[PDB]
Design a binder for these strands. Structure first.
Ligand SMILES: [Cl-]
Ligand SMILES: [Cl-]
Ligand SMILES: [Mn+2]
Ligand SMILES: [Mn+2]
Ligand SMILES: [Mn+2]
Ligand SMILES: [Mn+2]
Ligand SMILES: [Mn+2]
Ligand SMILES: [Mn+2]
Ligand SMILES: [Mn+2]
Ligand SMILES: [Mn+2]
Ligand SMILES: [Mn+2]
Ligand SMILES: [Mn+2]
Ligand SMILES: [Mn+2]
Lengths: 105, 84, 99, 93, 91, 110, 77, 96
DNA sequence: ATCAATATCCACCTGCAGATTCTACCAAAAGTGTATTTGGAAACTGCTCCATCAAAAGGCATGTTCAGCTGAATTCAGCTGAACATGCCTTTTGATGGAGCAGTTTCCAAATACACTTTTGGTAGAATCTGCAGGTGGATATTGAT
DNA sequence: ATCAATATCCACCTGCAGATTCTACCAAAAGTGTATTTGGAAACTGCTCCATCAAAAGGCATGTTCAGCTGAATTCAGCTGAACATGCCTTTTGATGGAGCAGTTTCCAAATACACTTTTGGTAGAATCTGCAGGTGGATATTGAT
């Protein structure tokens, strides 16, 4: 009976699919070990969980149910490691408020 | 067969530039900023669009897709999340 | 009975708080679309655009300009001013490695 | 036609960390872009590592070094821990 | 036995300046430069092929890569020289 | 079967100095699974590389002869690249041993 | 050991940068900057080194670390 | 006794070090620093000398460029003297 | 602002140590001939989106007035940083072993690939389910004129 | 240093746009069997680094003197913000053709495969050639006295 490799690795992210994707982005005649896809899946799953944890925290401190681009932006820009890892523009996320002291009346 | 498009950089109005500066935390704006900002914006847009169209023409399409713009932004070091 | 007036800068700071708390796009949407089409058609004529391509372009342009204004403001404050001027933009872009 | 995405897995992870919270479609789009970005960073550096050391197989070793290269500090430590755990549990079957 | 571009860089030098030589440290810089541009073009050509769901890197992918990666006038002249080369190679 | 036709390298056939065959092999080793490399792709790549090499060597040899010396140095390469708008934009890498292009901001001169 | 990057060496670097007058607090500040810079490059270089199961950091390891940080270096390949 | 006025030798030094290309940090303290830093990552590391030399070329090019940007910031404030706030402004705008 | 005095810079020089170039061999790579496959181009066609136009009201751009307060201009003292003589120590330079890694070759157990087949996890579109955007109004805080 | 004006903060409310589930299929994951590749253990071997040792010079540490630059203080004209009248053009949604992407099928030009020959590029030592260490003499620049 078929057992999914995701379940075998104790993961939510799809190990087999990620294996196909790895296999289609390595050098010519390149091979990919199975546990390479298991490790990659675990990495992606962990980073997703970290970002979602922070974004749900911002979402719950604003008294709403759903994570929005805004919450993603507050979460990523508010954590120094995530901020340094993700330099991309978060569409619809705006800015973290800040007024330099020499400008307030 | 649309009307000729001319001078549309002037559609980036002074209030729109001021709102952008405000989100950037700027409190006071010299009168010369607006023209300077239009200039900067235009260069930025040209570069991005020039790459997007290159991708479009490589794919033998006549429609610029969101992916083409995303790839052009990535190639310019201004990666964008949320469109592909 | 004199009409109420806020002091110069009180409304500016209110506007900063307003637009920093929100996430909407700040450039009108049809004028931006006309700009994108005018530029794109001087590269290849009768191009079409998906709606999402124009919107992706606007998100990028607005994120770029907000960032540029953050840096320009750092330069203006550095010179003990509160007013951004063209030399501030030019200094920010030079250190960014643009131009 | 059927375009694949990471949405169902992002939603599963969400429910694990915040059983009470949902996610808007535009934030899901941001999450999909993020997962694909990190995947191409890892895959690029893992193939490069393979070529520098003249291996032809991308193994979990290339993935682990890629993660140390690409991830800041604490993130890398914790990521390496989750990856190792998954690999040892997958091989124990 | 390590490969390099030194003999070909020297051939090109003797074509553009027959009287001039090159130091070994400058030859090392030229080698780094050649390898750098080559992996930029190859990376972008491979990406172009994959965006459009193809497996072959053709000279068309290389040409678009050159348009993407090289500034303005340089790209124009590069596209000319490459085209010239191909036309002489297939003849 | 007395005579073979003389072997002509792909470089020579394309009128190039840069090695088409070697570049074709490198191109095949940078392709993805099941990737192919077209016949003319390595010739195009070779020509691009030769063109850019020729440009920088031209400028650096000009700086080399305008300094009354035989050998191009890292210094000449750096001077040539930083003094050319397009090359400076294309090549942001550090040129070890090349120093900087001399320049003092006007407000610092006595 | 950071103090082995002496004040005259920092001044020479500033002079190549076209600097005419140098505040006394610059030297310590510069050392801090350099330390961070060096750490990052070295962190990646040795990473490459342990991936190859070597015990000698090579010039290639350094060059790859610098390229991966957007600070490509020509002439040591 | 001869004295140059403050600023003449500084400008002479600028022209001197901008026309030259040698390394400006002493080699032994830099190599000692490199090894000290590396030992908090992996024990009994060895280095090719060319690895240390590449590191020194990189660090010195980085610091020279940083000083160019720092000087632009000082000049922007109508000064000729670079100060820590100048370095900090340059590094912030650079994204460091 | 022309002198006379003083200091540094910058060509030019030679002789020789070392860097460049040349020369010859030989694994490895490039090329050829010949056979065989296949990715993708071409030609259809279905059928999404895309361009353009339309309507109408109000949200927002524009252009103006007027005065608060900012940037700019100027002065100047004290205090920092440049320049310099002096003298000491760190770095540099040159040499010598040998310890310990890299690099290379060989070689199987172990890993991965691939065709075929079975099976279901994951997707598109529809059907349900329901937060949250805005809309409104009162408490609190901030602001600017007295 | 007591208020009127105005904004902000923060609950409360609901309908429908959008978040989540449901539904039906099917693309691709997983199992099996068999073929092919390869990572890495084993056993070497020159050859790079490392450790040690030594002398001496030049580069740096230090202390002194003072010039000039930075920061503070002050004045003010005009520039930019706040507020308002006015009216236009942006916004939102729908229609209408139809352009052009997608999806599908077929078949070569174009690519790979494989055996074998020819060619070349890397390497190391010899043979040449050249920058460079110092030294000099004139060009140029700085400094203080009138
Ligand atoms: Cl200005
Ligand atoms: Cl400071
Ligand atoms: Mn036009
Ligand atoms: Mn067959
Ligand atoms: Mn086929
Ligand atoms: Mn009007
Ligand atoms: Mn002021
Ligand atoms: Mn004084
Ligand atoms: Mn099912
Ligand atoms: Mn609300
Ligand atoms: Mn030869
Ligand atoms: Mn000579
Ligand atoms: Mn000399």
């Amino acid at each position: 009976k078929a057992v999914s490799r995701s379940q075998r690795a104790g993961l939510q992210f799809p190990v087999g699919r990620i294996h196909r994707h790895l296999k289609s982005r390595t050098t010519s005649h390149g091979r990919v070990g199975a546990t390479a896809a298991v490790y990659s899946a675990a990495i992606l799953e962990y980073l997703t969980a970290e970002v979602l944890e922070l974004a749900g925290n911002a979402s719950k401190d604003l008294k709403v149910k759903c994570i929005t681009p805004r919450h993603l932006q507050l979460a990523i820009r508010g954590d120094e490691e995530l901020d340094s890892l993700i330099k991309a523009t978060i569409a619809g996320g705006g800015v973290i408020p800040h007024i330099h002291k020499s400008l307030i009346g | 067969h649309r009307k000729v498009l001319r001078d549309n950089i002037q559609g980036i109005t002074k209030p729109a530039i001021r709102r952008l500066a405000r989100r950037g935390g700027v409190k006071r704006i010299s009168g010369l900023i607006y023209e300077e900002t239009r200039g900067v914006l235009k260069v930025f847009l040209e570069n991005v669009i020039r790459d997007a169209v290159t991708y479009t023409e490589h794919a033998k399409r006549k429609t610029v897709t969101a992916m083409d713009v995303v790839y052009a932004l990535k190639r310019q070091g201004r990666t964008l999340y949320g469109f592909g | 009975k004199k009409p109420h007036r806020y002091r110069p800068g009180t409304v500016a700071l209110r506007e900063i708080r307003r637009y920093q708390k929100s996430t909407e796009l700040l450039i009108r949407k049809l004028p931006f679309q006309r700009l994108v089409r005018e530029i794109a058609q001087d590269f290849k004529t009768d191009l079409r655009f998906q709606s999402s391509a124009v919107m992706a372009l606007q998100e990028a342009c607005e994120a770029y300009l907000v960032g540029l204004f953050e840096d320009t403001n750092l330069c203006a404050i550095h010179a003990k001013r509160v007013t951004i001027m063209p030399k501030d933009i030019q200094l920010a872009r030079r250190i960014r490695g643009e131009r | 036609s059927r375009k694949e995405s990471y949405s169902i897995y992002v939603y599963k992870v969400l429910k694990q960390v915040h059983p009470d919270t949902g996610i808007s479609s535009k934030a899901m789009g941001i999450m999909n872009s993020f997962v694909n970005d990190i995947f191409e960073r890892i895959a690029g550096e893992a193939s490069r590592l393979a070529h520098y050391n003249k291996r032809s197989t991308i193994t979990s070793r290339e993935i682990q070094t890629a993660v140390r290269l690409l991830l800041p500090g604490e993130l890398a430590k914790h990521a390496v821990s989750e990856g190792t755990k998954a690999v040892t549990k997958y091989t124990s079957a």
